[PDB]
Amino acid sequence: ARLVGVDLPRDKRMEVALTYIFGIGRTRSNEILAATGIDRDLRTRDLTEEQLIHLRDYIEANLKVEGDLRREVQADIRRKIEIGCYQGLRHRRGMPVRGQRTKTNARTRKGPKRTI
């Protein structure tokens, strides 16, 4: 059942089914399903089209979802780079930016081992 262009997977409870939208976690998925009137323990295959109109307008007026959230995150990284801040130089090289330890770790911002 398409909601924002995300294709909610069938046979999944609606408190969890909204979390596959980029920009909605477990906390937002409680308050999406409190404004409309949809109970949490509802399967997504029993999802009436009259219900799905009630959460294609509360999301597009109060949250930020695919496309125009993902174009903000890769624009906020883009802002830090050309101004030449410390986190911009640290975003170019792929080294971790929040003052992490880079001597024995930081295998997520880097790849696997190189073993010189």
Binding site: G5, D7, E66, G67, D68
Partner: protein, 178 residues
């Protein structure tokens, strides 16, 4: 009797004479063919395009398409000559004007985060070509009973002489430009 063809010779046909000063009424542009192809380049392996690109364009466009072979062999792309690599349909007449309506009205705003189609995509003569994403947007195929997702590109061929003459035609049919 399609509703976009009768809308063409009701106000689009008259509006093109005021914007461009045509002497004779035979000079007014008109879309002639809409060419839709898949371009299944990953058919040089695994040989699955019969259910792939034939049983879905027939659902989208209406008629069975043409399996196109390949002209010459390319070693870097791992195909040889005469290998089925593309699938194409051609829409003329009443099924064409029923396709440009069903594209712009119900289909084309199902592109994910749709913002429009670029009007810089003319060839220089007055013909238009745009691409799509997958076996989404057209409702006639279903999201369940399909194979891997595959996109397309759609040619729109007009009788117009220059670009902005063909831009004024496709503007009045309902194409969203930006």
């Amino acid at each position: 009797q399609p509703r976009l063809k009768e809308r063409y010779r009701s106000e689009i046909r008259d509006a093109l004479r005021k914007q461009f000063g045509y002497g004779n009424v035979m000079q007014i542009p008109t879309v002639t063919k809409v060419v839709v192809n898949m371009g299944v380049g990953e058919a040089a392996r695994d040989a699955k395009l019969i259910n792939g690109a034939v049983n879905d364009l027939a659902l989208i466009t209406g008629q069975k398409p043409e399996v196109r072979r390949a002209r010459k062999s390319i070693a870097q792309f791992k195909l040889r000559e005469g290998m089925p690599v593309g699938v194409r349909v051609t829409l003329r007449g009443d099924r064409m004007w029923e396709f440009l309506d069903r594209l712009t009205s119900i289909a084309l705003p199902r592109i994910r985060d749709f913002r429009g189609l670029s009007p810089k995509q003319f060839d220089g003569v007055g013909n238009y070509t745009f691409g799509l994403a997958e076996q989404a947007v057209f409702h006639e195929v279903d999201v369940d009973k399909i194979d891997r997702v595959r996109g397309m590109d759609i040619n729109v061929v007009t009788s117009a002489a220059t670009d902005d003459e063909g831009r004024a035609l496709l503007r009045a049919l309902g194409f969203p430009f930006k």
